[PDB]
Amino acid sequence: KKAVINGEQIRSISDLHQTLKKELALPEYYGENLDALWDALTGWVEYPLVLEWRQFEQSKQLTGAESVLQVFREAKAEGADITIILS
Amino acid sequence: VINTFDGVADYLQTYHKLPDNYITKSEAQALGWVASKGNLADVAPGKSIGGDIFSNREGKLPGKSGRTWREADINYTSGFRNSDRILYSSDWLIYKTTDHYQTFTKIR
């Protein structure tokens, strides 16, 4: 399971959630909020997972991006097998 | 099987703990739960995920110094997880969400 974020194509926080929804094969009821993201990383998503996040900074501008990244890191801290590549 | 908003909400307020059909995410995994397989009822028949800390990341539930939140799945029987959750505080405030944490309603 590999998920790619093209940071330069993210024009809003909704864009980010929409990409995540597709890239992680999230549930159709996906809440598009940080609590919904946490729930999915810990009780939905398939592992091992590789998150490749390109142009992080552009996406940061546009959203946000940092809060979302932070959820991925806590999920990993807690043991989920997530590789994060920041290009 | 107590897994409805009111049955679990009443249970929490009466016994200050979740009903016996609940297990944490770590516990479940311990029995062989693989969220992407949707095999919880195969590995722990009659169980539902519940009891993990709820970090209230969007700050939608009321905070207070000393107050911690936890959550539990509601209306689950088998297969993949749904979008219903019960949220309960350490001082017994109870909220529910039916939309994957976009909105909450105070119920106790």
XYZ file of N, CA, C and O in Angstrom:
780
model
N 0.817 -1.266 0.000
C 0.000 0.000 0.000
C 0.830 1.286 0.000
O 1.511 1.752 0.940
N 0.801 1.977 -1.115
C 1.501 3.224 -1.380
C 0.536 4.351 -1.688
O -0.313 4.057 -2.553
N 0.611 5.489 -1.095
C -0.153 6.689 -1.214
C 0.795 7.836 -1.618
O 1.907 8.052 -1.095
N 0.447 8.598 -2.634
C 1.264 9.703 -3.139
C 0.465 11.000 -3.027
O -0.709 11.033 -3.423
N 1.089 12.021 -2.462
C 0.437 13.339 -2.385
C 1.211 14.316 -3.295
O 2.407 14.488 -2.980
N 0.686 14.890 -4.354
C 1.469 15.884 -5.159
C 1.147 17.225 -4.503
O 0.135 17.873 -4.811
N 1.946 17.632 -3.525
C 1.710 18.803 -2.764
C 1.367 20.023 -3.606
O 0.630 20.854 -3.081
N 1.913 20.132 -4.819
C 1.598 21.336 -5.591
C 0.173 21.281 -6.125
O -0.356 22.371 -6.423
N -0.500 20.165 -6.217
C -1.899 20.139 -6.674
C -2.900 20.376 -5.559
O -4.116 20.449 -5.785
N -2.532 20.541 -4.299
C -3.415 20.738 -3.162
C -3.674 22.243 -2.987
O -2.838 23.049 -2.561
N -4.908 22.626 -3.305
C -5.336 24.029 -3.235
C -6.195 24.337 -2.016
O -6.414 25.565 -1.831
N -6.552 23.345 -1.183
C -7.300 23.560 0.048
C -7.216 22.332 0.951
O -6.792 21.288 0.419
N -7.710 22.496 2.158
C -7.727 21.369 3.107
C -8.633 20.265 2.586
O -8.322 19.070 2.685
N -9.733 20.576 1.956
C -10.659 19.616 1.341
C -9.948 18.794 0.279
O -10.180 17.600 0.127
N -9.080 19.450 -0.491
C -8.313 18.780 -1.531
C -7.475 17.669 -0.878
O -7.394 16.560 -1.382
N -6.845 18.097 0.209
C -6.007 17.163 0.968
C -6.863 15.974 1.404
O -6.404 14.889 1.075
N -7.978 16.177 2.093
C -8.813 15.049 2.508
C -9.336 14.162 1.376
O -9.537 12.922 1.499
N -9.598 14.838 0.255
C -10.113 14.120 -0.933
C -8.994 13.198 -1.462
O -9.255 12.021 -1.808
N -7.767 13.718 -1.536
C -6.639 12.883 -1.977
C -6.355 11.667 -1.096
O -6.049 10.599 -1.608
N -6.439 11.927 0.202
C -6.230 10.924 1.248
C -7.301 9.834 1.080
O -6.948 8.663 1.165
N -8.533 10.316 0.869
C -9.651 9.383 0.700
C -9.398 8.388 -0.410
O -9.619 7.181 -0.256
N -8.941 8.831 -1.554
C -8.611 7.993 -2.701
C -7.337 7.189 -2.483
O -7.313 5.939 -2.525
N -6.240 7.905 -2.181
C -4.922 7.281 -1.935
C -4.904 6.226 -0.826
O -4.187 5.220 -0.981
N -5.682 6.373 0.235
C -5.718 5.382 1.310
C -6.920 4.457 1.206
O -7.046 3.643 2.125
N -7.751 4.609 0.184
C -8.964 3.769 0.047
C -9.786 3.846 1.321
O -10.183 2.905 2.000
N -10.030 5.077 1.784
C -10.805 5.343 2.990
C -12.290 5.038 2.761
O -12.745 5.031 1.614
N -13.031 4.793 3.842
C -14.466 4.524 3.767
C -15.244 5.644 3.091
O -14.855 6.837 3.218
N -16.356 5.291 2.447
C -17.152 6.349 1.798
C -17.680 7.372 2.792
O -17.893 8.534 2.386
N -17.858 6.985 4.070
C -18.358 7.903 5.111
C -17.247 8.769 5.695
O -17.591 9.557 6.585
N -16.038 8.590 5.202
C -14.870 9.328 5.701
C -15.197 10.762 6.066
O -15.593 11.674 5.325
N -14.972 11.032 7.360
C -15.249 12.361 7.928
C -14.450 13.556 7.522
O -14.863 14.661 7.910
N -13.328 13.473 6.837
C -12.523 14.627 6.405
C -12.207 15.605 7.498
O -12.379 16.806 7.330
N -11.765 15.042 8.629
C -11.362 15.836 9.789
C -10.206 15.046 10.426
O -9.974 13.886 9.991
N -9.492 15.622 11.375
C -8.359 14.892 11.987
C -8.718 13.651 12.828
O -7.937 12.677 12.837
N -9.891 13.714 13.484
C -10.429 12.592 14.309
C -10.820 11.449 13.382
O -10.512 10.283 13.731
N -11.417 11.745 12.249
C -11.803 10.772 11.247
C -10.500 10.193 10.673
O -10.497 8.968 10.452
N -9.487 11.033 10.486
C -8.225 10.495 9.926
C -7.541 9.503 10.869
O -7.051 8.449 10.486
N -7.492 9.889 12.158
C -6.932 9.025 13.197
C -7.637 7.654 13.246
O -6.995 6.591 13.389
N -8.984 7.686 13.189
C -9.826 6.502 13.228
C -9.479 5.588 12.060
O -9.359 4.378 12.235
N -9.339 6.197 10.891
C -9.015 5.413 9.729
C -7.602 4.853 9.753
O -7.412 3.706 9.266
N -6.631 5.628 10.219
C -5.255 5.068 10.206
C -5.133 3.882 11.175
O -4.461 2.878 10.961
N -5.840 3.947 12.283
C -5.862 2.963 13.340
C -6.967 1.941 13.235
O -6.834 1.023 14.074
N -7.973 2.037 12.413
C -8.998 1.008 12.414
C -9.642 0.842 11.053
O -10.863 0.604 10.982
N -8.859 0.997 9.980
C -9.438 0.831 8.643
C -8.394 0.462 7.579
O -8.450 -0.538 6.853
N -7.424 1.387 7.518
C -6.312 1.358 6.595
C -5.479 0.076 6.678
O -5.238 -0.593 7.697
N -5.005 -0.282 5.483
C -4.143 -1.426 5.286
C -2.662 -1.117 5.457
O -2.167 -0.075 5.012
N -1.964 -1.998 6.124
C -0.516 -1.848 6.322
C 0.232 -3.028 5.707
O -0.431 -4.030 5.446
N 1.530 -2.986 5.456
C 2.381 -1.809 5.682
C 1.935 -0.738 4.675
O 1.392 -0.984 3.599
N 2.172 0.500 5.075
C 1.836 1.664 4.263
C 3.031 2.580 4.006
O 3.842 2.829 4.891
N 3.083 3.065 2.786
C 4.087 4.050 2.380
C 3.369 5.320 1.929
O 2.571 5.359 1.005
N 3.621 6.401 2.679
C 3.116 7.724 2.399
C 4.233 8.581 1.744
O 5.201 8.945 2.464
N 4.103 8.860 0.448
C 5.075 9.719 -0.262
C 4.401 11.076 -0.478
O 3.462 11.195 -1.258
N 4.820 12.069 0.256
C 4.318 13.422 0.251
C 5.282 14.402 -0.436
O 6.261 14.886 0.145
N 4.992 14.732 -1.681
C 5.791 15.678 -2.465
C 5.301 17.110 -2.335
O 4.118 17.408 -2.156
N 6.283 18.008 -2.487
C 6.129 19.469 -2.369
C 5.375 19.796 -1.077
O 4.366 20.505 -1.163
N 5.782 19.260 0.041
C 5.093 19.465 1.309
C 4.836 20.938 1.536
O 3.741 21.388 1.874
N 5.889 21.720 1.385
C 5.760 23.167 1.623
C 4.713 23.872 0.793
O 4.092 24.800 1.322
N 4.494 23.514 -0.461
C 3.483 24.219 -1.269
C 2.085 23.967 -0.721
O 1.214 24.814 -0.705
N 1.912 22.702 -0.306
C 0.647 22.236 0.243
C 0.384 22.950 1.554
O -0.754 23.231 1.829
N 1.419 23.226 2.296
C 1.386 23.893 3.607
C 0.815 25.297 3.478
O -0.034 25.735 4.242
N 1.293 25.974 2.458
C 0.892 27.308 2.102
C -0.625 27.333 1.910
O -1.395 28.063 2.536
N -1.030 26.464 1.000
C -2.394 26.268 0.541
C -3.388 25.763 1.549
O -4.617 25.977 1.465
N -2.921 25.094 2.597
C -3.893 24.612 3.583
C -3.827 25.474 4.836
O -4.578 24.965 5.692
N -2.312 23.001 8.705
C -3.249 22.281 7.825
C -2.556 20.943 7.469
O -2.808 19.902 8.077
N -1.693 21.047 6.483
C -0.832 20.019 5.972
C -0.015 19.451 7.147
O 0.273 18.245 7.260
N 0.377 20.394 8.030
C 1.188 19.993 9.195
C 0.449 19.162 10.238
O 0.997 18.180 10.768
N -0.776 19.527 10.532
C -1.694 18.859 11.430
C -1.968 17.409 10.962
O -2.008 16.538 11.811
N -2.147 17.268 9.655
C -2.398 15.993 9.005
C -1.167 15.108 9.085
O -1.252 13.922 9.439
N -0.005 15.650 8.791
C 1.275 14.943 8.868
C 1.457 14.411 10.314
O 1.936 13.282 10.531
N 1.123 15.246 11.265
C 1.200 14.994 12.698
C 0.362 13.774 13.081
O 0.839 12.986 13.908
N -0.816 13.590 12.517
C -1.636 12.406 12.762
C -0.940 11.153 12.251
O -0.929 10.090 12.883
N -0.331 11.220 11.077
C 0.409 10.087 10.536
C 1.558 9.742 11.486
O 1.850 8.570 11.739
N 2.250 10.713 12.009
C 3.404 10.453 12.910
C 3.000 9.833 14.226
O 3.746 8.918 14.645
N 1.865 10.235 14.801
C 1.372 9.642 16.038
C 0.911 8.194 15.839
O 1.034 7.347 16.722
N 0.366 8.025 14.651
C -0.125 6.664 14.333
C 1.085 5.730 14.246
O 1.089 4.562 14.685
N 2.155 6.237 13.671
C 3.370 5.472 13.539
C 3.954 5.314 14.956
O 4.340 4.186 15.301
N 4.031 6.383 15.723
C 4.635 6.332 17.057
C 4.058 5.147 17.813
O 4.758 4.369 18.447
N 2.750 5.084 17.674
C 1.950 4.050 18.308
C 2.138 2.697 17.693
O 1.362 1.839 18.123
N 3.017 2.416 16.760
C 3.187 1.123 16.177
C 2.746 0.754 14.793
O 3.183 -0.332 14.316
N 1.906 1.535 14.125
C 1.442 1.256 12.754
C 2.683 1.372 11.877
O 3.535 2.244 12.109
N 2.750 0.474 10.949
C 3.823 0.333 9.964
C 3.640 1.279 8.756
O 3.158 0.935 7.664
N 4.060 2.507 9.045
C 4.001 3.600 8.095
C 5.368 4.188 7.777
O 6.026 4.635 8.749
N 5.719 4.151 6.504
C 6.962 4.801 6.082
C 6.590 6.182 5.515
O 5.729 6.278 4.637
N 7.158 7.257 5.986
C 6.842 8.618 5.501
C 8.024 9.206 4.760
O 9.128 9.319 5.302
N 7.829 9.565 3.514
C 8.851 10.167 2.652
C 8.387 11.585 2.345
O 7.282 11.835 1.881
N 9.231 12.507 2.739
C 8.979 13.938 2.588
C 9.933 14.432 1.503
O 11.131 14.545 1.745
N 9.346 14.617 0.332
C 10.169 15.155 -0.803
C 9.552 16.494 -1.211
O 8.938 17.160 -0.294
N -25.835 -8.291 24.159
C -24.995 -7.372 23.339
C -25.552 -5.964 23.533
O -26.632 -5.628 23.018
N -24.833 -5.164 24.260
C -25.292 -3.763 24.467
C -24.432 -2.937 23.536
O -23.254 -2.831 23.860
N -24.965 -2.476 22.436
C -24.170 -1.705 21.476
C -24.936 -0.599 20.784
O -24.628 -0.204 19.635
N -25.952 -0.075 21.466
C -26.784 0.995 20.901
C -26.407 2.267 21.655
O -25.837 2.096 22.735
N -26.721 3.439 21.137
C -26.356 4.664 21.893
C -26.869 4.692 23.320
O -26.095 4.981 24.288
N -28.173 4.445 23.541
C -28.755 4.472 24.898
C -28.372 3.335 25.832
O -28.184 3.553 27.022
N -28.332 2.122 25.258
C -27.921 1.013 26.146
C -26.501 1.291 26.672
O -26.280 1.175 27.893
N -25.541 1.631 25.799
C -24.158 1.903 26.239
C -24.075 3.181 27.076
O -23.365 3.206 28.078
N -24.818 4.211 26.754
C -24.799 5.456 27.503
C -25.347 5.197 28.909
O -24.808 5.744 29.854
N -26.415 4.381 28.980
C -26.953 4.126 30.327
C -25.988 3.295 31.131
O -25.811 3.509 32.321
N -25.420 2.315 30.455
C -24.447 1.398 31.112
C -23.273 2.147 31.722
O -22.877 1.937 32.890
N -22.714 3.062 30.919
C -21.566 3.922 31.337
C -21.880 4.749 32.568
O -21.130 4.849 33.553
N -23.062 5.348 32.485
C -23.467 6.173 33.639
C -23.813 5.342 34.890
O -23.645 5.862 35.988
N -24.320 4.135 34.690
C -24.674 3.280 35.809
C -23.462 2.552 36.354
O -23.327 2.586 37.588
N -22.668 1.939 35.516
C -21.512 1.201 36.018
C -20.156 1.868 35.860
O -19.209 1.259 36.363
N -19.989 3.013 35.260
C -18.716 3.672 35.084
C -17.664 2.800 34.402
O -16.515 2.846 34.775
N -18.068 2.098 33.386
C -17.218 1.282 32.547
C -18.094 0.828 31.378
O -19.342 0.881 31.404
N -17.421 0.401 30.326
C -18.119 -0.125 29.162
C -18.624 -1.559 29.390
O -17.964 -2.283 30.149
N -19.682 -1.934 28.679
C -20.211 -3.307 28.728
C -19.100 -4.258 28.296
O -18.161 -3.917 27.574
N -19.241 -5.520 28.668
C -18.281 -6.560 28.373
C -18.089 -6.895 26.928
O -17.159 -7.686 26.695
N -18.864 -6.412 25.987
C -18.655 -6.793 24.581
C -17.663 -5.878 23.864
O -17.461 -6.026 22.660
N -17.067 -4.965 24.588
C -16.092 -4.047 24.029
C -14.646 -4.430 24.232
O -14.399 -4.867 25.347
N -13.755 -4.216 23.281
C -12.330 -4.477 23.456
C -11.539 -3.340 22.797
O -12.057 -2.885 21.802
N -10.392 -2.937 23.281
C -9.597 -1.897 22.644
C -9.020 -2.427 21.336
O -9.076 -3.630 21.000
N -8.528 -1.504 20.532
C -7.899 -1.750 19.256
C -6.641 -2.650 19.475
O -6.442 -3.565 18.646
N -5.865 -2.390 20.501
C -4.676 -3.239 20.747
C -5.116 -4.665 21.098
O -4.593 -5.614 20.486
N -6.079 -4.801 22.026
C -6.607 -6.092 22.383
C -7.086 -6.927 21.212
O -6.842 -8.152 21.126
N -7.815 -6.232 20.343
C -8.388 -6.861 19.140
C -7.333 -7.448 18.198
O -7.405 -8.552 17.644
N -6.296 -6.632 18.020
C -5.150 -6.950 17.179
C -4.493 -8.213 17.749
O -4.132 -9.064 16.949
N -4.436 -8.196 19.068
C -3.873 -9.287 19.857
C -4.644 -10.568 19.501
O -3.991 -11.621 19.484
N -5.931 -10.486 19.195
C -6.654 -11.697 18.846
C -6.554 -11.961 17.368
O -7.184 -12.933 16.949
N -5.862 -11.133 16.624
C -5.804 -11.439 15.187
C -6.598 -10.516 14.287
O -6.784 -10.895 13.131
N -7.013 -9.380 14.857
C -7.761 -8.416 14.079
C -6.836 -7.647 13.132
O -5.824 -7.109 13.581
N -7.294 -7.610 11.875
C -6.624 -6.901 10.781
C -7.737 -5.998 10.236
O -8.600 -6.597 9.572
N -7.673 -4.705 10.584
C -8.732 -3.778 10.170
C -9.022 -3.900 8.681
O -10.224 -3.974 8.346
N -8.008 -3.897 7.835
C -8.347 -4.008 6.416
C -9.007 -5.344 6.059
O -9.586 -5.397 4.955
N -8.986 -6.385 6.858
C -9.655 -7.620 6.423
C -11.147 -7.520 6.777
O -11.986 -8.183 6.156
N -11.404 -6.689 7.788
C -12.804 -6.558 8.248
C -13.134 -7.884 8.982
O -14.302 -8.244 8.982
N -12.174 -8.529 9.620
C -12.389 -9.808 10.298
C -12.598 -9.788 11.800
O -12.370 -10.789 12.503
N -13.051 -8.674 12.391
C -13.248 -8.617 13.852
C -14.231 -9.677 14.389
O -13.938 -10.303 15.417
N -15.351 -9.839 13.704
C -16.327 -10.805 14.230
C -15.857 -12.239 14.058
O -16.400 -13.135 14.729
N -14.864 -12.463 13.211
C -14.320 -13.790 12.997
C -13.348 -14.118 14.137
O -13.278 -15.297 14.501
N -12.659 -13.089 14.592
C -11.682 -13.343 15.652
C -12.141 -13.085 17.075
O -11.464 -13.453 18.062
N -13.266 -12.401 17.221
C -13.830 -12.001 18.516
C -15.313 -11.765 18.285
O -15.808 -10.644 18.233
N -15.981 -12.920 18.163
C -17.439 -12.873 17.912
C -18.082 -12.122 19.086
O -17.653 -12.248 20.261
N -19.077 -11.339 18.696
C -19.816 -10.551 19.670
C -19.130 -9.324 20.240
O -19.810 -8.639 20.992
N -17.879 -9.064 19.880
C -17.111 -7.920 20.350
C -17.208 -6.746 19.353
O -17.409 -6.947 18.142
N -16.967 -5.567 19.910
C -16.966 -4.316 19.187
C -15.745 -3.550 19.707
O -15.369 -3.713 20.884
N -15.126 -2.738 18.891
C -13.986 -1.912 19.293
C -14.501 -0.816 20.203
O -15.528 -0.141 19.908
N -13.869 -0.536 21.313
C -14.278 0.527 22.204
C -13.368 0.545 23.417
O -12.818 -0.503 23.807
N -13.239 1.758 23.960
C -12.444 2.065 25.114
C -11.139 2.820 24.931
O -10.603 3.264 25.954
N -10.706 3.025 23.691
C -9.474 3.793 23.409
C -9.629 5.271 23.732
O -10.734 5.828 23.698
N -8.549 5.942 24.030
C -8.534 7.386 24.302
C -8.936 8.058 22.979
O -8.588 7.595 21.891
N -9.663 9.128 23.137
C -10.193 9.991 22.105
C -9.462 11.306 22.311
O -9.707 11.903 23.377
N -8.640 11.661 21.309
C -7.889 12.926 21.540
C -8.582 14.213 21.163
O -7.911 15.247 21.382
N -9.820 14.173 20.646
C -10.566 15.386 20.345
C -9.682 16.405 19.626
O -9.511 17.581 20.035
N -9.159 15.926 18.519
C -8.215 16.633 17.652
C -8.779 17.877 17.027
O -7.984 18.792 16.821
N -10.037 17.989 16.704
C -10.659 19.181 16.148
C -11.146 20.065 17.267
O -11.644 21.124 16.958
N -11.074 19.734 18.533
C -11.517 20.467 19.686
C -13.031 20.666 19.756
O -13.484 21.629 20.402
N -13.829 19.804 19.153
C -15.294 19.906 19.157
C -15.919 19.516 20.489
O -16.999 20.082 20.775
N -15.359 18.644 21.293
C -15.920 18.312 22.603
C -15.297 19.284 23.617
O -14.138 19.709 23.510
N -16.082 19.548 24.655
C -15.653 20.484 25.686
C -14.475 19.987 26.460
O -14.445 18.841 26.895
N -13.496 20.854 26.679
C -12.314 20.411 27.434
C -12.332 20.995 28.817
O -13.072 21.958 29.042
N -11.523 20.468 29.695
C -11.353 20.875 31.079
C -10.084 20.203 31.602
O -9.737 19.095 31.184
N -9.408 20.894 32.522
C -8.193 20.334 33.131
C -8.639 19.122 33.953
O -9.616 19.182 34.700
N -7.995 17.996 33.702
C -8.217 16.685 34.295
C -9.143 15.746 33.521
O -9.296 14.552 33.818
N -9.829 16.277 32.520
C -10.795 15.554 31.711
C -10.184 14.820 30.564
O -9.511 15.464 29.766
N -10.385 13.517 30.481
C -9.897 12.762 29.322
C -11.159 12.164 28.650
O -12.215 11.983 29.316
N -11.066 11.939 27.335
C -12.145 11.380 26.534
C -11.669 10.029 26.027
O -10.494 9.682 25.805
N -12.660 9.208 25.794
C -12.596 7.853 25.215
C -13.758 7.633 24.245
O -14.763 8.362 24.341
N -13.641 6.625 23.381
C -14.705 6.417 22.405
C -15.039 4.957 22.207
O -14.141 4.207 22.598
N -16.187 4.621 21.650
C -16.500 3.203 21.423
C -17.349 3.139 20.164
O -18.066 4.141 20.025
N -17.238 2.064 19.439
C -18.058 1.881 18.252
C -19.490 1.546 18.668
O -19.629 0.815 19.674
N -20.444 2.059 17.930
C -21.874 1.836 18.180
C -22.477 1.206 16.906
O -22.055 1.414 15.737
N -23.493 0.356 17.130
C -24.256 -0.380 16.152
C -23.397 -1.322 15.340
O -23.790 -1.673 14.207
N -22.262 -1.758 15.864
C -21.461 -2.696 15.055
C -21.855 -4.171 15.313
O -22.037 -4.504 16.508
N -21.925 -4.963 14.268
C -22.191 -6.427 14.486
C -21.056 -7.232 13.827
O -20.453 -8.078 14.506
N -20.719 -6.972 12.578
C -19.609 -7.683 11.935
C -19.168 -6.998 10.655
O -19.894 -6.108 10.186
N -18.034 -7.390 10.100
C -17.581 -6.747 8.823
C -16.737 -5.503 9.131
O -16.201 -5.405 10.255
N -16.641 -4.597 8.163
C -15.880 -3.366 8.398
C -16.617 -2.420 9.335
O -17.845 -2.426 9.476
N -15.852 -1.551 9.970
C -16.369 -0.516 10.884
C -17.228 0.498 10.125
O -17.067 0.818 8.932
N -18.183 0.962 10.905
C -19.180 1.956 10.518
C -18.765 3.364 11.014
O -17.621 3.600 11.489
N -19.708 4.295 10.870
C -19.424 5.655 11.269
C -20.026 6.120 12.584
O -19.954 7.354 12.788
N -20.539 5.209 13.402
C -21.166 5.601 14.663
C -20.247 5.389 15.847
O -19.706 4.319 15.962
N -20.171 6.408 16.664
C -19.378 6.389 17.867
C -20.060 7.095 19.030
O -20.821 8.044 18.892
N -19.742 6.580 20.209
C -20.130 7.142 21.518
C -18.803 7.693 22.116
O -17.734 7.042 22.065
N -18.835 8.884 22.659
C -17.710 9.608 23.241
C -18.025 9.855 24.713
O -19.090 10.424 24.969
N -17.109 9.494 25.606
C -17.412 9.652 27.024
C -16.242 10.222 27.790
O -15.161 9.694 27.505
N -16.526 11.154 28.679
C -15.482 11.764 29.452
C -15.279 11.046 30.783
O -16.100 10.251 31.243
N -14.106 11.400 31.333
C -13.682 10.878 32.627
C -14.626 11.385 33.724
O -14.740 10.750 34.782
N -15.395 12.438 33.509
C -16.371 12.938 34.474
C -17.777 12.619 33.958
O -18.721 13.300 34.295
N -17.890 11.618 33.089
C -19.132 11.084 32.544
C -20.050 11.916 31.699
O -21.294 11.785 31.763
N -19.502 12.813 30.842
C -20.262 13.574 29.857
C -20.331 12.568 28.692
O -19.321 11.875 28.459
N -21.464 12.490 27.987
C -21.547 11.505 26.899
C -22.060 12.192 25.644
O -23.040 12.911 25.763
N -21.369 11.997 24.557
C -21.758 12.567 23.281
C -21.798 11.416 22.289
O -21.322 10.320 22.551
N -22.399 11.667 21.143
C -22.474 10.679 20.068
C -22.145 11.401 18.750
O -22.311 12.632 18.707
N -21.708 10.592 17.804
C -21.452 11.066 16.439
C -22.061 9.993 15.499
O -21.923 8.822 15.855
N -22.725 10.355 14.419
C -23.241 9.335 13.485
C -22.633 9.661 12.130
O -22.866 9.062 11.085
N -21.782 10.703 12.161
C -21.175 11.072 10.887
C -19.662 11.102 10.847
O -19.030 11.978 10.196
N -19.028 10.150 11.505
C -17.556 10.027 11.474
C -16.836 11.280 11.920
O -15.946 11.807 11.295
N -17.270 11.691 13.081
C -16.819 12.777 13.916
C -16.954 14.166 13.334
O -16.205 15.037 13.819
N -17.848 14.395 12.386
C -18.002 15.782 11.867
C -18.820 16.569 12.860
O -18.495 17.702 13.194
N -19.854 15.904 13.377
C -20.687 16.556 14.370
C -20.972 15.620 15.554
O -21.007 14.405 15.376
N -21.189 16.276 16.692
C -21.464 15.569 17.919
C -22.742 16.002 18.572
O -22.989 17.225 18.446
N -23.401 15.117 19.307
C -24.605 15.565 20.036
C -24.465 15.214 21.518
O -24.129 14.032 21.769
N -24.721 16.040 22.487
C -24.647 15.675 23.887
C -25.900 14.836 24.190
O -27.035 15.245 23.851
N -25.602 13.685 24.801
C -26.710 12.756 25.123
C -26.826 12.441 26.605
O -27.863 11.900 26.987
N -25.879 12.778 27.430
C -25.935 12.605 28.903
C -25.075 13.808 29.373
O -23.784 14.370 28.747
